[PDB]
Amino acid sequence: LTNDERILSWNETPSKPRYTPPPGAIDAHCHVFGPMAQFPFSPKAKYLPRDAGPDMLFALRDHLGFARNVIVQASCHGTDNAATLDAIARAQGKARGIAVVDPAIDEAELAALHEGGMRGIRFNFLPKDKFLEVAGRLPAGWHVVIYFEADILEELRPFMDAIPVPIVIDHMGRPDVRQGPDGADMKAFRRLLDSREDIWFKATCPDRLDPAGPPWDDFARSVAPLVADYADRVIWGTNWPHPNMQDAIPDDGLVVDMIPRIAPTPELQHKMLVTNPMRLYWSEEM
Secondary structure, three states: OOOHHOOOOOOOOOOOOOOOOOOOOEEEEEEEOOOOOOOOOOOOOOEEOHHHOOOHHHHHHHHHHOEEEEOOOOHHOOOHHHHHHHHHHHHOEEEEEEEOOOOOHHHHHHHHHHHHEHHHEEEEOOOOOOHHHHOOOOOOOOOOEOOOOOHHHHHHHHHHHOOOOOEEEHHHHHOHHOOOOOHHHHHHHHHHHHHHEEEEOOOOHHHHHHHOOOOOOHHHHHHHHHHOOOHHEEOOOOOOOOOOOOOOOOHHHHHHOHHHHHOOOOHHHHHHHHHHHHHOOHHHHH
């Protein structure tokens, strides 16, 4: 099962962003796939991606003008965090990570994840409340990363109200950006952000949220006011190498170029790309 028989989901020659990130910018949402010969995929994987290893991730990072990454365990690796852990170590201090864990994971195994640069675990609502259970015994300084869609937010509110650690929401819970910055989903999402002092969100994935394609004007107009209103709670990522996006492969250059549209001032850019992800992933440096 060679490399070019497996699924490519990223642009192999992405454009250079016209946007220049500030020094110390963090891509807080990216992944690695394998390399398969070193780190097998999980028997449960929905599809077998091509290798997208640390070398490619760091090349992409430097190309996009970023300094650091948060490497988020990819679902093609299940609860085996080896590939992510190896990538983080290979960043030589320039990465931290998010894990996917079996809810029966040891206190000792979680401490080893911590030592290996993990600062959280991810739940994907797309095993009822073991999730609250494991979230209550995470090493200190950890958060949970959660993904959901707008249409399940209501039924999820009590669960998230219970989570004992800070919360990071991926892609803002997938609001329908066609509605505008004051539409139903954004209203519902703001209710969530207002419920707690420690709910953060990733203002990401215009490619997924906005069915119109670039320049993703609906994403820009709907998301910029959220970023402005919740500037101390927002982070950002490329989502490279774009798991399951083989039918709509984005150009990472244009993805980065959304940053100045959703965060128009240097201060908003500084918060979203440096101050906020540092507070969450490298708190010891703050």
